[PDB]
Amino acid sequence: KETAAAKFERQHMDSSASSSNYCNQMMKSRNLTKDRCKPVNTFVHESLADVQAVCSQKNVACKNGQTNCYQSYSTMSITDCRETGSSKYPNCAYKTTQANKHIIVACEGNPYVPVHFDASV
Amino acid sequence: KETAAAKFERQHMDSASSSNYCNQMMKSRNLTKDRCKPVNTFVHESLADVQAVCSQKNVACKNGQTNCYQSYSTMSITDCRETGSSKYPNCAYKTTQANKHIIVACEGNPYVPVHFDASV
Ligand SMILES: [Cl-]
Ligand SMILES: [N]
Ligand SMILES: [N]
Ligand SMILES: [N]
Ligand SMILES: [N]
Ligand SMILES: [N]
Ligand SMILES: [N]
Ligand SMILES: [Pt+2]
Ligand SMILES: [Pt+2]
Ligand SMILES: [Pt+2]
Ligand SMILES: [Pt+2]
Ligand SMILES: [Pt+2]
Ligand SMILES: [Pt+2]
Ligand SMILES: [Pt+2]
Ligand SMILES: [Pt+2]
Ligand SMILES: [Pt+2]
Ligand SMILES: [Pt+2]
Ligand SMILES: [Pt+2]
Ligand SMILES: [Pt+2]
Ligand SMILES: [Pt+2]
C-alpha cells in the first residue's frame, strides 16, 4: 500500500514551473486525473531534504485542529495547479501559477516527514 | 566520449512495430557491435516523460544504490530478448510489447536517467 509519506511525495514534490502546460502534464504524471480531475494541487519545487526539514521548523495548528503542522521558515518555489471552470473529466485542464511562498505541512511517523500539504502562505 | 545520459537515450529511448522491431533497433543502436547484448528494453515515451521519472517514486536499485526511481504510471516498453539460434555476429531478438512501470537510475546536474534498472 502507498504510505502517507509516499503519497505526499507523489502529489506535492517536484524536485526536478517552466510552461503554461506544466500542471496538465504533472497532474497526469502523478495519477491525479485517473478517476476524477483533482481540482486543486500544489507542487513544491525544492529538494526533498529541504521540504522534510520543515518538520523541525515553526510548529502551527493544522486546518483540522491537529498540532502536528509546521510552517517553513523560508519561502519555497511552488506551482499552484487549479482546474479551469471549463475543465471536464476525462479532459482535465489546469491553470499553472508559480509563486515563492511559505508552505505548511502535517508531519508524522519515523522518520518524521510531511504526510499532508496543509496550505501555502 | 559518450555521456551516461547520452548512452541511456541511445540504448533505451524510442520517442513495438513488429517481430522485426528489435532485430533492427538492437543493430541500429549499436547494441550488437561487441557482442549480442542478451536483453534490452526500449521505452516508447517522450524524453520529457522519462526524465520526469527521476522525480517520482524513490526505490532501491538492484545493485543496492539508492538513486532508482519507479514511474507512477505504466509506460509502453519493448523487451528485446536474444534467441537460441541467435549467434554473434548474427544476433536475433524476440520482440515482447508491454505496458509496465519502469525503474531507472538517475545521476548528475541536471538529474537524468543513466541506467534502466527494471520494469514492474
Ligand atoms: Cl531545486
Ligand atoms: N505504491
Ligand atoms: N498529500
Ligand atoms: N509561533
Ligand atoms: N489540513
Ligand atoms: N520569509
Ligand atoms: N503497479
Ligand atoms: Pt522546478
Ligand atoms: Pt511565532
Ligand atoms: Pt516570508
Ligand atoms: Pt492527510
Ligand atoms: Pt495532498
Ligand atoms: Pt488538509
Ligand atoms: Pt513505440
Ligand atoms: Pt511515460
Ligand atoms: Pt506505487
Ligand atoms: Pt501499477
Ligand atoms: Pt549504468
Ligand atoms: Pt542499459
Ligand atoms: Pt543494471
Q: What are the CA-CA distances from residue B85 to residues B21, B26, B36, B49 (Å)?
A: 18, 16, 12, 36
User: What superfamily in CATH does domain A2-121 come from?
Assistant: Ribonuclease A-like domain (3.10.130.10)
CB A38 within 8 A of CB A7: no
DSSP states along chain A: ---HHHHHHHHHB-----STTHHHHHHHHTTTTSSS---EEEEE-S-HHHHHGGGGSEEE--TTS-S-EEE-SS-EEEEEEEE-TT-BTTB--EEEEEEEE-EEEEEETTTTEEEEEEEE-
Q: Do B112 and B56 touch, CB atoms closer than 8 A? A: no
Residue list, annotated binding site of B for substrate:
7, 10, 37-41, 62, 81
At residue B57's C-alpha, the angle toward residues A11 and B67, to 5°, is 140
The phi, psi pair for B22, rounded to 5°, reads -65, -50
Residue B120 DSSP class: -
Residues in chain A within 8 Å Cβ distance of B70: none
Q: How far is the CA of A74 from the centre of ligand 15 (A)?
A: 33
Query: Is A28 touching B (CB cutoff 8 A)?
Result: yes
Cβ-Cβ contacts under 8 Å for A74 (sequence gap 6 or more): A102
**Homologous superfamily of B2-120 in CATH?**
Ribonuclease A-like domain (3.10.130.10)
Cα Rg of chain B (Å, integer): 14
Using alpha carbons, select from B82, B102, B98, B74 the residue that is nearest to residue B8.
B102
Give A108's Cβ-side CA count (13 Å radius).
13
User: By what technique were these coordinates determined?
Assistant: X-ray
Instruction: Note the resolution in Å, 1 decimal.
Output: 1.8
- CA atoms of A43 and B21, how far apart (whole Å): 39
Domain ranges of chain B: 2-120
